[PDB]
Design a protein around this ligand. Sequence first.
Ligand SMILES: OC[C@H]1O[C@@H](O[C@H]2[C@H]3OC[C@@H]2O[C@@H](O[C@H]2[C@@H](O)[C@@H](CO)O[C@@H](O[C@H]4[C@H]5OC[C@@H]4O[C@@H](O[C@@H]4[C@@H](O)[C@H](O)O[C@H](CO)[C@@H]4O)[C@H]5O)[C@@H]2O)[C@H]3O)[C@H](O)[C@@H](O)[C@H]1O
Ligand code: CA
Ligand code: CA
Length: 626
Amino acid sequence: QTHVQLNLNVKHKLGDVTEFNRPKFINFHATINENYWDSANKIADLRDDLIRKYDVYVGRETGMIKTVLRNVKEDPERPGFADPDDLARLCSQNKKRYVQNTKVHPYEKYSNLILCNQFSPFYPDGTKTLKGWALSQKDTEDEPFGTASGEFYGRYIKEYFGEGGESGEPKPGFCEVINEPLWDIYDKPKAPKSSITKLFEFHSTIAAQVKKFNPDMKVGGYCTAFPDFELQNFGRWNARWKQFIDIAGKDMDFFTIHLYDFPCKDGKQMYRKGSNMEATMDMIEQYSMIKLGEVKPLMISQYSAQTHDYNRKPWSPYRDWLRLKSTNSMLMQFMERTDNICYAMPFAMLKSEWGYNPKTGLAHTARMLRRENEPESFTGEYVYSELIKFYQLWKDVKGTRVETNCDNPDIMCDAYVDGKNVYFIINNLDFKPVDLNLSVNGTSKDAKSIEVRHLYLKGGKDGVPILDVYDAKSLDHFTLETEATCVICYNFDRKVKINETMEEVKYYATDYLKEIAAGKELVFNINNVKKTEYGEAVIRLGLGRNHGLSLLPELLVNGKKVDIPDNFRGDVQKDRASFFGVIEVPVDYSILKGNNTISLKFPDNGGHVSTVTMQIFNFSNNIRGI
Ligand SMILES: OC[C@H]1O[C@@H](O[C@H]2[C@H]3OC[C@@H]2O[C@@H](O[C@H]2[C@@H](O)[C@@H](CO)O[C@@H](O[C@H]4[C@H]5OC[C@@H]4O[C@@H](O[C@@H]4[C@@H](O)[C@H](O)O[C@H](CO)[C@@H]4O)[C@H]5O)[C@@H]2O)[C@H]3O)[C@H](O)[C@@H](O)[C@H]1O
Ligand SMILES: [Ca+2]
Ligand SMILES: [Ca+2]
């Protein structure tokens, strides 16, 4: 059995973050004003049900800005620029419509918009708009590449947005430059394979133009489709994210990526959830520290699963389950880095009727709503898809984060205390059920009631997701299903007393990305580590190696041997072309100092140590009783 401990009197602080952030995490890729809320739905007031009743936030939108770009007239004085007057006119028309849409104004408190451009025709590669002109492709001293695209974006923001309600739509919280650009530039079928660094330069130019018109706006990039750093023996890292940080990092307010699991790509299962995404995120942070001297806030503006083998099929509950299980696991991992994550948005749209293709009968593959007669036909009124089960599972969850421990790296856990209520969340990265033994420490009182919520798959492949919700008299043991999540809600007679603190601090090494040779010591240094009397620690070894090569180096920390566990977070990456993941290594706190030397020695040749970082967990008192 796996032992899962909730220390509900011990605050878990990370930076200045001590609380669950519902807007940052419990959200979807929608806006309050899309017209799809207001027709063809079984529920008459769907905003009240989804946004208000479930307390769900928004959002992200790229379609309105695309429509304006594709239809705006060209400046007669400046070939390749949007006409400022016509741009102001189109934006004013849209503003007037927002101003008159008074029914949506009370929902602005649920909205913090991520604005982004779709790749085309915003990227100035010669693609013409519906008006027959292309954004300027110049790259001169006075007109650096992207000047016209940037001016369009800055003017759009200035002209369309107001300050809420009858003054116009609130300004976006975040402006991403461009969606998944290297997919179109380099990786898609028949891509032109034009310059990669030119796209990075373009980001600095866009940021400068947006800020010329809108001085306080936050700009970010590069909104990566598939951040796959280990490919070509880390040549992909070196050509892409490394260069983006070197070229544009200083000009970005935030970094942004997309993270998708591949549960079914020609029958293969290639996951990011677990150790792989830990390696991706650690590498961005570590190289940002080396080059920029600071970790940049990270946005994940689309995440969950891409379901290739089901993307030419009609809707099913099973396809929704594939998305659900990736969402829950990735969310837990983003919650662990809440101090350096500014926004994480599951890729689920409200309705996306525009994505229905009548030639094939295929609807959009990531919808909160589906028509009642799907999958047989795209007819009938809209009802919730199975993706609503995510928001049902996470309903009410809020409060001050408290310490949890689960002695199986395939089991992730977290917990939040909201007055009398405690939410204990447990997620399974393993591909079988896991029996859990639960301990709740730090109070002398038993809970008044326990509500168990368990989201799992019934019936195997092509089965259905089930959200079981029930009251329990006690919960000392619980079997968490394959890739499942539970949210256990404890209700107490009186407010829970939080009287200790565990402060987590993450430390980076002085260097990174070292080639592995057999028998050759690799030395990393992690310095200025602050210790207290009582604490715990985890060393984080990012390894990128071909299959068959050892993931069990000899590890010395300050000259002392430290064992590496056989088990790490998530799957062994069998169907991936190589292993890329962080191996988390508990380390005796007494071995650590302020300046630390971490030595690795492998028995075999090949691959890299991508990063070595360390989490320190410092206690306010002897909370373990050692
Ligand atoms: O499209 C017009 C429409 O856009 C709407 O806004 C879009 C904008 O923000 C939300 C909407 O979707 C986003 O784009 C994503 C979306 O189109 C999904 C599909 O639902 O696709 C995602 O990209 C996919 C596609 O291209 C890159 C990525 O993967 C690709 O698949 C590949 C496989 O085919 C292959 O076998 O394997 C490789 C890996 O090796 C890939 O997996 C492909 O599926 C998009 O990110 C944003 O564009 C707007 O709201 C509307 O008004 C209207 O403008
Ligand atoms: Ca990309
Ligand atoms: Ca990449």
